[PDB]
Amino acid sequence: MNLNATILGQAIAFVLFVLFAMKYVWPPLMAAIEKRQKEIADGLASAERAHK
Amino acid sequence: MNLNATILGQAIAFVLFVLFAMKYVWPPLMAAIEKRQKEIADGLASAERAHK
Amino acid sequence: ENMTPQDYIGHHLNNLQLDLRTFSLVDPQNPPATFWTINIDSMFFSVVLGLLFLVLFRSVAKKATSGVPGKFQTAIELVIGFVNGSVKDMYHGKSKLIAPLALTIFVWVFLMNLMDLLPIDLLPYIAEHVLGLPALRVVPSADVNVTLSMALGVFILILFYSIKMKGIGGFTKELTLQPFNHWAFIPVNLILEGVSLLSKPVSLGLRLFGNMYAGELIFILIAGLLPWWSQWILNVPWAIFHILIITLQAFIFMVLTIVYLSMASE
Amino acid sequence: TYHLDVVSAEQQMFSGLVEKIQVTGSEGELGIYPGHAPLLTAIKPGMIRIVKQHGHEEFIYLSGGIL
Amino acid sequence: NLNMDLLYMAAAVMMGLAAIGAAIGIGILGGKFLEGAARQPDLIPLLRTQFFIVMGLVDAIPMIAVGLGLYVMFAVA
Amino acid sequence: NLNMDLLYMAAAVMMGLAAIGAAIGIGILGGKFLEGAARQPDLIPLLRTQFFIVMGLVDAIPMIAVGLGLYVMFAVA
Amino acid sequence: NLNMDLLYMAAAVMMGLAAIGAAIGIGILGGKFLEGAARQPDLIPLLRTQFFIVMGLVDAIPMIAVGLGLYVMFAVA
Amino acid sequence: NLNMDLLYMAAAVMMGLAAIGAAIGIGILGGKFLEGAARQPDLIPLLRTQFFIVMGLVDAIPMIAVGLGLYVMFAVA
Amino acid sequence: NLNMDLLYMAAAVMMGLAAIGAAIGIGILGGKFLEGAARQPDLIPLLRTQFFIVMGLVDAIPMIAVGLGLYVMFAVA
Amino acid sequence: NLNMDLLYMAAAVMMGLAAIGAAIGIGILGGKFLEGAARQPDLIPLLRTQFFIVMGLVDAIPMIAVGLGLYVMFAVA
Amino acid sequence: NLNMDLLYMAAAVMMGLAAIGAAIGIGILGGKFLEGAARQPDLIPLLRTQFFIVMGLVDAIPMIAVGLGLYVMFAVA
Amino acid sequence: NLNMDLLYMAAAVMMGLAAIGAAIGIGILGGKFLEGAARQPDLIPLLRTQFFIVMGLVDAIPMIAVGLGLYVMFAVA
Amino acid sequence: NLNMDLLYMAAAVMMGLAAIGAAIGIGILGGKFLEGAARQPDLIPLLRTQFFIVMGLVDAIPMIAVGLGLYVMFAVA
Amino acid sequence: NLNMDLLYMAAAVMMGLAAIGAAIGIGILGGKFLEGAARQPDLIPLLRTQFFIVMGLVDAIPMIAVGLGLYVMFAVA
């Protein structure tokens, strides 16, 4: 249909949401998740060292 | 044409759609959430036992 | 009410627009010809859903517990783990952008498509009868401009990664030699590799647009054409089938974006 | 679950209950779950994975055979 | 005048080619689903889930064309 | 007038292509059903159940095109 | 006038396409039936009992196409 | 009179389409018959019995379309 | 003028679709004949006998359609 | 009117051929996906990702044709 | 004059349809010949003999179709 | 006027044929890739490499036809 | 108009159907060749010589169609 | 005069049908290539060589037809 300036308007909104998510949203969640997953694996490593 | 009846038909259809959506679609999602809460609770409890 | 169904459908297809050179809202039948004429109602819901996504994810990102997670936390981490698993299967470089880009696309497009499930007249009824504005159609992804904006963003990215990760010498070497590797073929290969690259984003955008636009057009036709008692029996099967469409169209947008960036850089 | 036998011409090698197995048939990898339709194939030399019910995984080296 | 019957003919072409495409595509998919189901019967609920996933894509274009057929037939007569 | 000529031609091309699509799509499905039964008939009632489940999806678009062909032929005349 | 000539053309299209659809659909299904009977000659009873069941669905739409082609050729034209 | 000539196109199309569909439908069915025969040649008469049974259905619609093809070319003309 | 033109176009479709039907139907049938022959060459003469029986059915319905095409070209002019 | 009515037929051709091409191509790929899932279910997660990769190539030109068809019918109208 | 100039389209259809039919039907037959040769290379000349034997039947209808296409193009038009 | 009007039909036919050709050829090549991958998962990176190699070749000609279809719609309009 | 443009259309039909027939027929033949070659990694010349012979048969009739298309392109028009 | 538009129609027909033929032929051939590669991975450069050998042969008529369609559309029209 009508190709329109909205193409630029949406591109600006898109890049702003990408940069706020990238710095502010993804590293905090992945850091909390991986901190849990790592400390559980540290439990597995402790059980192996105990038997060994 | 009876525009008020068209809004009537849209409401009836949405009531039936939400009945199907809540009863069938939502329990599978809640069961996946509760599965992962069980999975993490067991993971942490086994690591806690490995410390002692 | 003086509605013929063909006109009712015609009104339902039309957007609301604003002239950037005159600041006038556009008429039910008289558009300005100038391209500077923003589609305001889809912009409004597009940013409202982008805000609602960023609010929900930042709210848990600040709260986040490393112990047994809260139930809402559990759902947000579920989607984070699903995205991360897909990206890490398809992509192997260190580039920090890929995962947040895939998450933002997936969630934003999912919420936009999810807007179509809502009853088609209820918000247009509120917007015209309460606010007096001459048109409203609420599904942001059911317009080409937004999906091409996203696709052209990904095209800019594809060109940025393909230059940045293997340089103009390699990039031209790919675009000229393959497939047939001889100079007489280079004129042909420049055409083929160019239109192939052009098709990757444009088809990315048009895949989402066609499915969402016709998905809405069916609900418009069902409301306009049929009597109230009959409208539910046809409406419900299409709504439940549409749930499967809205999910797959979001997921395919995400996956093809990752596949193209991993194929370009690596 | 289903019953699995690994039998050589000389002596038996496995007789437990299994939930699934993975093998390299001659025409590719092949994964047998419960109720699977009747099938006959050679298998190539190399390992077979058993998961005994309750999920216990083990690897048996086979010099070939017929499945 | 001519205008009505030519638009009805255009919708008739859209519906006919959509019906061919959808019917052959789901027929092929269903045949491979049934030969898979005859192989691992306890898996049939799992494979049926994957069948529904791929069926959504196979249906995607035929429903676009059907909707535009109904638009040309009813909406512009 | 001229409109009745093309209205019957449009109805005939739409329902003829819908018949090709439906008949071949089910034939292709049915062959894999038979070959699956012929190897282990004990599955036949189970596989026949799945055959109807997928056959109902095959007929979705062809029967829509048949309904529009009947409407064009009888109601639009 | 012209009307009968294009009516006979339309019915000719509808019956030609219905003959294609029924012929190829039954030909594929029969081929797999003949395989099935060769794999177990003893079962050539049960397989035939099915084959008819599938053939009824395969034919159902082409029979409509023939029915309406005869309706046009001998009632309308 | 244009009426004279147009009936010949309507018959030529019916008999051409019925020839394509009957020839491919029996070609496929006979192919599976021949590979059945090459596996169990003692059965060849029994499979001939089933092959002729199924061939009668495959031909059922094509013979109708050729019969009306002749009726339009000789008898309506 | 055009009276004589359209009967040749009717022959062009009649003979062209009959050529496709005959060519594919025998190409498939002979392909399975060659596979069964390559598995068991001592069997070749018996399969050659069955092949010519099945081919006679495949080949007849196109050949009569071509004969009607030559009738339209030469005798109907 | 003289200029507008034909455009709906041109779009109807673009959409019909795109619908056939995408629906059959995706049906074929999905069939091989479901076979692969039946032979080794633990692969199903891996193979579903490979399916979406190859399916992303399959429907690119059909979706280009669907986009330009929707442009012609809505924008030029 | 159109009376001749339009007959070239009839010759183009008649021979073009014979060309696709002959090329695909020989391509199928030759493919099964090449698999038979690949499995048993001891057997090549006998399979080549039977391949030529059925290949004559396959060609028979296409060659008369091309011959009448050349006759109409050179001698009638 | 017809110069302007008919060029949209000419583009429409080009885009529809390029869509069928590309989608079918890529669907077949991808299906054989998925079955090969399901049989030999360790080969998956190697086969995916060859798949993109051979798909470049398949893809080459339809992109020519779509590129000209766009030039016919927009550039010569 | 009525003379030369129909000649260009007839040539385009002849050569388009020739390209379809030749490309599909040799694609099938070459696919069976490659399957035999991968089965017999030593007999590649022995099989490929047979491939060239039967390919010569497949290619000869569409090349007749190409020569006739070039005759209409240059010598008639 | 109108004489140029049908030259764009002819080029659209010939280029589309050449793109169908080339894409489907290379798709089938490359599929059988990938099957062979998946069985015998060390053999892949040898099979890749043989594939390119037949790969050039399938597209020769498509390359002729595309060349002639460029000639008609750019040079004549």
Q: Which two tokens stand for residue L9?
A: 């039909």
Q: Which of J3, J40, J58 sits opposite L23 (nearest CB)?
A: J58
d(C-alpha G7, C-alpha G70), whole Å: 11
Closest by Cα among C33, J12, F73 to E76: J12
Question: At residue C3, what are phi and psi to the nearest 5 degrees?
Answer: -115, 115
**Residues H11 and H70: beta-carbon distance below 8 Å:** yes
Number of domains within chain D:
1
Concatenate the DSSP letters of all residues of chain C into one string.
----HHHHHHHHH---EEETTT-PBPPSS---SSS-EEEHHHHHHHHHHHHHHHHHHHHHHHH--SSSPPHHHHHHHHHHHHHHHHHHHH--S--TTHHHHHHHHHHHHHHHHHGGGS-TTHHHHHHHHTT--S-----GGGSHHHHHHHHHHHHHHHHHHHHHHHHHHHHHHHHHHTTT-SGGGHHHHHHHHHHHHHHHHHHHHHHHHHHHHHHHHHHHHHHHHS-HHHHHHHHHHHHHHHHHHHHHHHHHHHHHHHHHHHHHH-
Chains H and I touch (3+ CB pairs under 8 A): yes
Question: At residue D58, what are phi and psi to the nearest 5 degrees?
Answer: -150, 160
Residue B37 CA to its chain's centroid (Å)? 15
Q: Do M10 and K15 touch (CB under 8 A)?
A: no
Q: Around D23, how many Cα atoms within 13 Å sit in the side-chain half-sphere?
A: 21
Q: Which two tokens stand for residue C27?
A: 């008429």
Burial of N55 (0-12, 13-18, 19+ CB in 10 A): buried
The identity of residue F28, as a single letter, is I
Q: Do C224 and B6 touch (CB under 8 A)?
A: yes
**Residues G54 and G22: beta-carbon distance below 8 Å:** no
What residues form DSSP beta bridges with C17? C39
Q: Do H21 and G26 touch (CB under 8 A)?
A: no
Question: At residue D42, what are phi and psi to the nearest 5 degrees?
Answer: -70, 160
Closest by Cα among M18, L66, L29 to N62: M18
Q: Which two tokens stand for residue M23?
A: 């490309």
* 3-class SS string, I18-35: HHHHHHHHHHHHHHHHHH
The identity of residue D6, as a single letter, is V
Q: Which of J18, J57, J58 sits opposite L16 (nearest CB)?
A: J18
Look up tokens 């003028």; give the residue. I1
Q: Which two tokens stand for residue C38?
A: 């923003």
H-run or E-run covering D23:
strand D17-25
Q: Do C67 and A28 touch (CB under 8 A)?
A: no
d(C-alpha F37, C-alpha G36), whole Å: 8
Q: Which of H17, H35, H46 sits opposite G16 (nearest CB)?
A: H17
Q: Do D27 and L39 touch (CB under 8 A)?
A: yes
**Residues C26 and C144: beta-carbon distance below 8 Å:** no
Residue D60 CA to its chain's centroid (Å)? 9
**Residues B32 and C78: beta-carbon distance below 8 Å:** yes
Q: After which residues is chain C broken (C to N over 2.5 A)?
A: none
H-run or E-run covering D19:
strand D17-25
Residues with Cβ within 8 Å of residue G11, at least 6 apart in sequence: F12, G69, G70, G72, G73, G77, H10
Residues with Cβ within 8 Å of residue D52, at least 6 apart in sequence: D16, D17, D18, D19, D58
**Residues H34 and I50: beta-carbon distance below 8 Å:** yes
Please tell me the total number of residues recorded for chain F in this structure. 77
Closest by Cα among D33, A47, H63, C71 to E37: D33
Closest by Cα among G7, N32, C11, F72 to M34: N32
d(C-alpha M68, C-alpha K12), whole Å: 9
**Residues J74 and L10: beta-carbon distance below 8 Å:** no
d(C-alpha C159, C-alpha C161), whole Å: 6
Residues with Cβ within 8 Å of residue N15, at least 6 apart in sequence: L14, L17, L64, L65, L68, N65, N66, N69
Closest by Cα among F36, D35, F14 to G10: F14
Q: Look at strands D2-3 and D42-43 and give their pairing.
A: unpaired
Q: Which two tokens stand for residue C167?
A: 């340089």
d(C-alpha H57, C-alpha H53), whole Å: 7
Give D34's contacts in chain E (Cβ within 8 Å). 42
Give E21's contacts in chain F (Cβ within 8 Å). 21
Tell me the three state secondary structure of residue B1: coil
Q: Which two tokens stand for residue M5?
A: 């443009």
What residues form DSSP beta bridges with D6? D14
d(C-alpha N25, C-alpha M29), whole Å: 10
Q: Identify how the structure was determined.
A: cryo-EM
**Residues M52 and K50: beta-carbon distance below 8 Å:** no
d(C-alpha G31, C-alpha G42), whole Å: 18
The identity of residue K43, as a single letter, is L
- Neighbouring subunits of F (3+ Cβ pairs under 8 A): D, E, G
**Residues I25 and I58: beta-carbon distance below 8 Å:** yes
Helix orientation angle between E44-70 and C228-265, rounded to the nearest 10 degrees: 110
Concatenate the DSSP letters of all residues of A19-42 into one string.
HHIIIIIHHHHHHHHHHHHHHHHH
Q: Which two tokens stand for residue F30?
A: 């049915």
Residues of chain A contacting B, Cβ within 8 Å: 36, 39-40, 42-44, 46-47, 50
Q: Which two tokens stand for residue J22?
A: 């995408």
Q: Which of F16, F18, F31 sits opposite G29 (nearest CB)?
A: F31
Q: Around C39, how many Cα atoms within 13 Å sit in the side-chain half-sphere?
A: 28
Question: At residue C17, what are phi and psi to the nearest 5 degrees?
Answer: -135, 160
Chains L and J touch (3+ CB pairs under 8 A): yes
Q: Do K26 and M54 touch (CB under 8 A)?
A: yes
Residues with Cβ within 8 Å of residue N19, at least 6 apart in sequence: L17, L18, L21, L22, L61, L62, L64, L65, N62, N66
Concatenate the DSSP letters of all residues of C201-228 into one string.
HHHHHHHHHHHHHHHHHHHHHHHHHS-H
Cα–Cα–Cα angle for D34, D39, D40, nearest 5°?
135
* Residue pairs between chains E and F whose CB atoms are closer than 8 Å: 136
Q: Do D33 and J39 touch (CB under 8 A)?
A: no
**Residues E47 and E37: beta-carbon distance below 8 Å:** yes
H-run or E-run covering D20:
strand D17-25
Residues with Cβ within 8 Å of residue A46, at least 6 apart in sequence: B47, B50, B51
d(C-alpha M57, C-alpha K22), whole Å: 10
Closest by Cα among D65, D2, D61 to D31: D2
E5 is catalytic: no
Chain I nearest-CA residue for H26:
I58
CATH value at residue D20: 2.60.15.10
**Residues F19 and G61: beta-carbon distance below 8 Å:** yes
d(C-alpha A6, C-alpha C45), whole Å: 13
Q: Which two tokens stand for residue C53?
A: 């996504």
What's the gap in Å between the CA of L34 and the closest CA on chain J? 6
- List Cα–Cα distances, M56 to K23, M8, M63, N57, in angstroms: 11, 28, 10, 11
**Can you state the percent helix, strand and coil of chain H, rounding each to 5?**
95, 0, 5
Chains A and H touch (3+ CB pairs under 8 A): no
Q: Which two tokens stand for residue F2?
A: 């001229």
Cα–Cα–Cα angle for K68, K70, K71, nearest 5°?
60
Q: Which two tokens stand for residue M27?
A: 């694609």
H-run or E-run covering L50:
helix L44-70
Residue K20: how many other CB atoms lie within 10 Å: 29
**Residues C68 and B41: beta-carbon distance below 8 Å:** yes
F1-77 homologous superfamily? F1F0 ATP synthase subunit C (1.20.20.10)
Q: Please state the domain extents for chain M.
A: 1-77
Q: Which of M15, M30, M51 sits opposite N68 (nearest CB)?
A: M15
d(C-alpha G29, C-alpha N48), whole Å: 37
**Residues N19 and M18: beta-carbon distance below 8 Å:** no
d(C-alpha E7, C-alpha E19), whole Å: 18
Concatenate the DSSP letters of all residues of F5-73 into one string.
HHHHHHHHHHHHHHHHHHHHHHHHHHHHHHHHHHH-GGGHHHHHHHHHHHHHHHTHHHHHHHHHHHIII
Give C218's contacts in chain E (Cβ within 8 Å). 63, 67, 70
**Chain J interface, best mutation among C198, C206, C216, C218, by max J CB count within 10 A:** C206
* 3-class SS string, chain N: CHHHHHHHHHHHHHHHHHHHHHHHHHHHHHHHHHHHHHHCHHHHHHHHHHHHHHHHHHCHHHHHHHHHHHHHHHHHC
Alpha-helical segments (H) within chain I: 2-39, 44-70
Q: Residues of B24-46 as b/e, b for ≥16 C-beta within 10 angstroms?
A: eeeeeeeeebeebbeebeebbee
Concatenate the DSSP letters of all residues of C143-159 into one string.
SHHHHHHHHHHHHHHHH
Closest by Cα among F57, C237, J40, I20 to E28: F57
Residue G38 CA to its chain's centroid (Å)? 25
d(C-alpha E67, C-alpha E11), whole Å: 10
What's the gap in Å between the CA of A1 and the closest CA on chain J? 5
**Residues N36 and N47: beta-carbon distance below 8 Å:** yes
